[PDB]
């Protein structure tokens, strides 16, 4: 039983449409445990259409 498992479960219904949901989840866990402060935002800065988001998920 997990805490980000529920985070991911939340994004089952509605995809967060222009970031890949799965990389985000590890990112927030990395962000809170690996505690790099910029990365999640930077990850999004690099992130720069439904198809492209799908590709983002596959690559991860």
């Amino acid at each position: 039983i997990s805490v980000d498992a529920l985070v991911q479960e939340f994004f089952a219904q509605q995809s967060l449409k222009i970031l890949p949901q799965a990389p985000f989840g590890d990112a927030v866990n990395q962000f809170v445990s690996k505690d790099d402060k910029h990365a999640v935002e930077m990850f999004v800065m690099d992130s720069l259409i439904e198809d492209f988001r799908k590709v983002m998920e596959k690559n991860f």
Binding site: I1, L6, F10, F11, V28
Partner: protein, 400 residues
Amino acid sequence: SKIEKLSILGVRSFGPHHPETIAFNTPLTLIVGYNGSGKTTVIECLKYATTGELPPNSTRNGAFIHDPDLVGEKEVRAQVKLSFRSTIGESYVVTRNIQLLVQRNNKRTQKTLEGSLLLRNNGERTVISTRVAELDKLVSEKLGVPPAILDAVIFCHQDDSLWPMSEPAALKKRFDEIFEAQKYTKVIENIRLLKKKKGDELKVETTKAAIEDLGRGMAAVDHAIMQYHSKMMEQINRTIAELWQSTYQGTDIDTIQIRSDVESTTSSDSGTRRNYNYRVSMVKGDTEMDMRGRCSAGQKVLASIIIRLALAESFCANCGLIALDEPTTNLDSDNIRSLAESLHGIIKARQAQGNLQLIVITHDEEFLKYMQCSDFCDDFYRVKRDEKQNSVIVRESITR
């Protein structure tokens, strides 16, 4: 995730010149000795290697360390070696060395000398860290166990063994630690500020896109936390109820439940912020009443153990690691047997999985007997004092 072996030198009653090693059996390690043998000392060492935390009341004056005065030293060094196995099954070793120095006027200084964590693989060993702060975080990560519950639940000090029965303020502090509540609150506050940060700075599709994502992410964290807390609480409470029913002799109390109370803050910008107040409650017949200030000594010990077991099962990754230091404290004839039987049941149920490590420390004959033969344990450890009054570790085969 297994712990394999622990070697102790120069701590407490243990000598600084010849080290003592204990090998941890699966699924039960029994350590028995007379008063002051050095049994509790072992868990402290187990606690230190994994957490980097010294026992409460032993932080300064080199209380932890075998006293310099007995041996004619100005310096004593204590080293703790723990060889353990990862969740993945990679083999690791963690060692901690500490220096105690004696100056003139009888004053003493205690210092952490060095910490090293190496990996045992193939024929080669690789060092991951010599930094102590890294050590604590990594070992918690490597074992698959959060650092907070290692301190609170897995390796609870005999002195702190009753914490689930402390006053509401302290009890709340301990639970918040276990739930990592503060860190989750900080990360959510962090993302919203970042969202607003970018909003101010404000290709168009990317922006509308980011706002949809950010609302979703913050909502998920907020929702996942609540759901996590509610879920964890309920399974824990069910484990507690079951154990107390199976174990607690006597008809005065039907069951025991942890009650959690919320203060809720409502925001459109910040989502929801939750504050938890915890209390342990009895139930007799239809009545529920708060235990604190209202329970017996035997009830206190028993309820505390049960809360610890439930917490470990639900919170910790399903590796059966817990250490119990004199569980039989203040328990009557019937309750001692019952605990042993409950423990034996827990071992049989959870053995099939294959990874359970249970450590029981005792000086009590009846309790020792119920566990001793029936369990698959082929060996146990006795702790005696030698003539130099140093503690030695002896392994006894029950066969002979």
